[PDB]
Write a protein that binds this DNA or RNA. Structure first.
Ligand SMILES: [Mn+2]
Ligand SMILES: [Mn+2]
Ligand SMILES: [Mn+2]
Length: 692
DNA sequence: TGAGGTAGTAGGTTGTA
DNA sequence: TACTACCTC
DNA sequence: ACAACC
C-alpha cells in the first residue's frame, strides 16, 4: 500500500527557468499595465509591485515603455522574485486550464463541470491550485471541492406568480467575482450604498440556510464522498491538465510521498489511566472508576413548558436525575440534590423567560455553591425575544461564576421513548431494583453516549478529572493560545496543562478581554509566570521543558519568551498547529484500486508535518489532516508530533474523540466564551472547564 | 443547547526587497 | 472568523 | 492588488 499526497514536485529547479523581466518607474503598481498587456497579447503574465514577469516575449505593448528589459533567471535569495515566479506559474496553469479544459475562474477556484441536478440546484466541481517554492524546488498542491447555484433568475420569480421580499439575499456573478446583497427595477444594497440592476442578472443565493427541506438531504449526499471517489476525481483531472502543460515536467506517478520528499511514520494509540491502564477511553468509562472522584451538589432548574407545551412532569425529571445518580457512585462520584430549590416552586413560567433580565438576581442565594441543571425548552433558548441560553450563560458565568448544564426537551423525549419501547414506567425515584433495570436496558442503546456526555460535562464543570494518560510525555508543561474575532472585538483563550500525563487540565486565571488583536508583552509574561508558578505549586519543583501550542501562525514576540524562560533556566518550544491545510492523505491499495486512511499517520519533511487524527465513516466524509510546524530547535520534531497526537486523547468533556489536541480545542472554546461574556476568572488548583 | 465528525456558504484582517 | 446542513456514538 | 490564514 503506497502512501499518496495531493501534491507534486517538478523536475526543473527554480533557477533553471528562463523568464523575461520588465521594470517600470502603493501595492497596486502596474496592475493596469498587466491587464492591458494580457488583453492585447494573449499570454500568461504576472506582476509584483512594479515588475512584470512572463515566459514569452511581449510584442504588443500598447504604447508602454519600461525602464529595463532583461531575459535572465530567478535569484533564489530574493523572496520578491520567488513570489513573482510563483504567481506566474499559477497564472500559466490557470491559463492552460481555461483554454484546454473549458474551466471558468469563478470565485477563488476553477469551476469545471456540473455533476448533479438536484431539483433546480446545480452542484459543480471546483479545484484550488497552490504553488510554492521550497529550497529551489517548485511544488504544486491542489484541492477539490464543490459549488452551488440555482437554475432560475429573479426574472423567473417576476413571472409565473409570487414576489420577492425586500430583504431577500441575491448574488450577481460577473464571472470572476460575485457580490451578495417585465424587467422591473431592483434596489439591492451590499452596504449603505445604493445599487440597481435589470433583475435579469441577479440570482438567489444558494446556502444551506436558504435551501428548502427535502433538498438539503440530497445535496448533502453529493458533497460527502468516499475517499476513493474524491482522490480519483482529483487525480484524473490533474493528469488531464498535466497532459497539456509544457513549462514544467513531472514524473509519471508524481503523487506518491517518495516523489515529494516526505517520510512515513505510524503512531499508536496511547493508554489511559482511570484506576488501572485501559486500552480505550470508552471501555474505561463503561467499566471503570474515575481518576479523581469527589462530591457534587446539584440544583434543578425546571420550567413549566415541559408540562404545558409537552407531556413531561417534574417527577419524570427527578427520576431521570435519579438514573443519572445511579450511573454515578458506581464510578466513584457522589451527587446530592440541593434542597434549597424548594421555595421557588412554579417560578419558571413564560413570563419569567420574557422578563428574565428583571426577574433575575433573586436566584443567586439558592443556586450558590452548586452546579445548575437547566431544563429549558428549545424554543425559549432559541427565540430572539427570549434568548434563554445567552442570558442564562451570561448571568451565571460572568456575574456569579456558577456552572450550569443545559438539557432540552428532545433529550427527555428520547429517554421516555426508550422507556415506552421497553415498557418500563415504574417509580424510578426513591425506589431501587428499577433504576438498575433501566441502566441495564440503557447499556444496549445509543442513548448511553448521550447520558455519559451529560455526566462528563457535569464532572468537568464540578472539578472531577475522569482520566489521565497512562504513559509520560516528552514535555512537562503545555500552553494553548488562541484569539477570537467578533464584531470588531477580540478575546484570548489561554489554557494550562500541568504534568506530563495531564494531571491537571485548567485555564489561566487571567482576563481574556483585549483591545485589538495584539497579545501584549505584559499578558504573555503573566501567562508564562503563572504557568511556572502553578507547576511549582503542583509538583514542588520547577519544570524542565515547556511547550507552547499556537492556533494559527505565531505572531507574538519570540524574544520575550526566551528572556522570561532563560531567567528560570527552563527550556521551551513553540509549535504552530494549522487546521484546514487544504491537503489530503490516503493509502492506495492496488489489489482493489481503492483509497483508505489510517489514524495516526505522519508525513514529515523538514520542520513541517501532516498528521491524521480521525477515522470518520464512509457517509461522514474524509479525514482532515493537521499541519504541524516547529519554530524552535530544542526538541526532536518526532517527539513534538508524538506529544501533539497524544494530547488529543484527553477529551475529558465527552466520550467522542476530538481531532485537535486538548490545548487548542479548549483554548478556542475559552476565547469564544470570553467573547460572549459567559465566563469569569476563578483561582484554584482543580480541573476547571466551565465552557466544556 | 448530549457530544464529536466533515463539507458547503459569506466576510475580515495581515503582510508583501 | 462566523454560520448552516447532514451522520455517528 | 494577491496571498494566506482566519
Ligand atoms: Mn485561530
Ligand atoms: Mn478558534
Ligand atoms: Mn457543553
Amino acid at each position: 500500500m503506497e502512501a499518496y499526497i495531493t501534491e507534486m514536485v517538478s523536475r526543473e529547479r527554480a533557477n533553471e527557468l528562463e523568464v523575461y523581466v520588465y521594470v517600470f518607474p502603493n501595492y497596486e503598481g502596474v496592475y493596469h499595465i498587466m491587464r492591458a498587456w494580457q488583453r492585447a497579447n494573449d499570454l500568461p503574465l504576472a506582476y509584483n509591485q512594479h515588475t512584470i514577469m512572463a515566459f514569452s516575449p511581449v510584442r504588443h505593448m500598447c504604447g508602454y515603455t519600461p525602464m529595463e528589459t532583461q531575459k535572465r533567471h530567478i535569484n533564489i535569495d530574493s523572496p520578491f522574485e520567488r513570489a513573482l515566479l510563483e504567481r506566474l506559474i499559477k497564472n500559466s496553469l490557470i491559463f492552460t486550464a481555461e483554454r484546454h479544459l473549458h474551466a471558468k475562474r469563478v470565485g477563488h477556484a476553477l469551476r469545471l463541470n456540473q455533476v448533479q441536478q438536484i431539483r433546480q440546484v446545480i452542484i459543480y466541481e471546483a479545484i484550488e491550485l497552490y504553488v510554492n517554492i521550497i529550497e529551489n524546488r517548485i511544488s504544486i498542491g491542489f484541492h477539490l471541492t464543490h459549488q452551488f447555484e440555482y437554475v432560475y433568475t429573479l426574472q423567473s420569480m417576476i413571472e409565473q406568480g409570487k414576489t420577492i421580499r425586500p430583504g431577500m439575499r441575491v448574488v450577481h456573478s460577473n464571472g470572476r467575482q460575485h457580490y451578495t446583497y417585465s424587467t422591473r427595477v431592483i434596489h439591492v444594497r451590499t452596504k449603505e450604498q445604493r445599487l440597481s440592476y435589470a433583475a435579469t442578472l441577479l440570482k438567489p443565493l444558494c446556502t444551506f440556510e436558504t435551501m428548502q427541506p427535502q433538498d438539503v438531504l440530497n445535496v448533502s449526499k453529493c458533497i460527502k464522498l468516499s475517499a476513493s471517489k474524491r482522490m480519483k476525481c482529483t487525480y484524473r483531472w490533474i493528469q488531464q491538465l498535466r497532459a497539456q502543460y509544457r513549462h514544467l515536467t513531472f514524473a509519471p506517478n508524481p503523487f506518491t510521498i517518495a516523489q515529494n520528499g516526505y517520510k512515513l511514520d505510524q503512531l499508536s494509540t496511547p493508554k489511559v489511566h482511570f484506576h488501572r491502564d485501559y486500552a480505550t477511553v470508552v471501555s474505561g468509562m463503561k467499566t471503570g472508576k474515575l481518576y479523581k472522584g469527589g462530591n457534587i451538589k446539584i440544583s434543578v432548574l425546571f420550567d413549566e413548558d415541559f408540562y404545558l407545551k409537552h407531556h413531561i412532569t417534574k417527577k419524570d425529571i427527578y427520576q431521570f436525575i435519579a438514573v443519572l445518580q445511579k450511573i454515578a457512585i458506581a464510578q466513584g462520584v457522589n451527587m446530592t440534590i440541593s434542597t434549597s430549590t424548594k421555595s421557588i416552586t412554579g417560578k419558571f413560567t413564560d413570563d419569567f423567560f420574557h422578563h428574565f433580565t428583571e426577574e433575575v438576581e433573586a436566584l443567586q442565594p439558592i443556586f450558590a455553591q452548586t452546579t445548575v441543571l437547566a431544563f429549558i425548552t428549545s424554543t425559549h433558548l432559541s427565540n430572539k425575544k427570549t434568548r434563554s441560553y445567552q442570558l442564562l450563560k451570561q448571568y451565571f458565568g460572568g456575574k456569579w461564576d456558577i456552572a450550569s448544564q443545559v438539557i432540552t426537551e428532545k433529550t427527555i423525549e428520547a429517554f421516555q421513548k426508550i422507556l415506552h419501547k421497553h415498557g418500563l414506567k415504574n417509580f424510578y425515584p426513591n425506589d431501587e431494583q428499577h433504576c438498575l433495570r433501566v441502566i441495564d436496558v440503557l447499556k444496549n442503546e445509543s442513548f448511553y453516549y448521550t447520558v455519559m456526555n451529560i455526566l462528563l460535562g457535569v464532572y468537568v464543570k464540578s472539578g472531577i478529572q475522569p482520566w489521565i494518560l497512562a504513559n509520560t510525555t516528552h514535555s512537562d508543561c503545555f500552553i494553548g493560545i488562541d484569539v477570537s474575532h467578533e464584531n470588531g472585538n477580540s478575546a484570548a483563550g489561554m489554557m494550562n496543562v500541568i504534568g506530563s500525563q495531564g494531571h491537571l487540565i485548567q485555564q489561566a486565571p487571567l482576563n481574556g478581554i483585549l483591545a485589538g488583536e495584539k497579545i501584549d508583552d505584559t499578558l504573555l509574561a503573566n501567562l508564562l509566570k503563572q504557568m511556572i508558578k502553578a507547576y511549582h505549586t503542583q509538583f514542588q519543583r520547577f519544570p524542565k521543558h515547556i511547550t507552547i501550542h499556537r492556533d494559527g501562525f505565531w505572531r507574538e514576540h519570540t524574544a520575550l519568551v526566551e528572556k522570561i524562560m532563560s531567567h528560570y533556566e527552563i527550556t521551551y518550544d513553540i509549535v504552530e498547529i494549522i487546521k484546514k491545510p487544504n491537503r489530503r492523505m490516503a493509502f492506495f491499495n492496488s489489489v482493489d484500486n481503492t483509497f483508505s486512511t489510517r489514524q495516526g499517520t505522519v508525513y514529515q519533511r523538514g520542520n513541517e508535518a501532516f498528521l491524521c487524527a480521525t477515522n470518520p465513516q464512509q457517509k461522514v466524509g474524509m479525514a482532515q489532516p493537521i499541519k504541524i510546524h516547529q519554530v524552535t530547535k530544542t526538541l526532536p520534531f518526532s517527539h513534538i508530533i508524538e506529544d501533539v497526537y497524544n494530547l488529543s486523547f484527553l477529551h475529558i468533556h465527552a466520550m467522542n474523540k476530538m481531532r485537535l489536541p486538548a490545548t487548542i480545542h479548549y483554548a478556542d472554546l475559552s476565547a469564544t466564551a470570553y467573547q460572549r461574556g459567559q465566563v469569569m476568572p476563578r483561582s484554584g488548583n482543580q480541573t476547571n472547564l466551565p465552557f466544556v
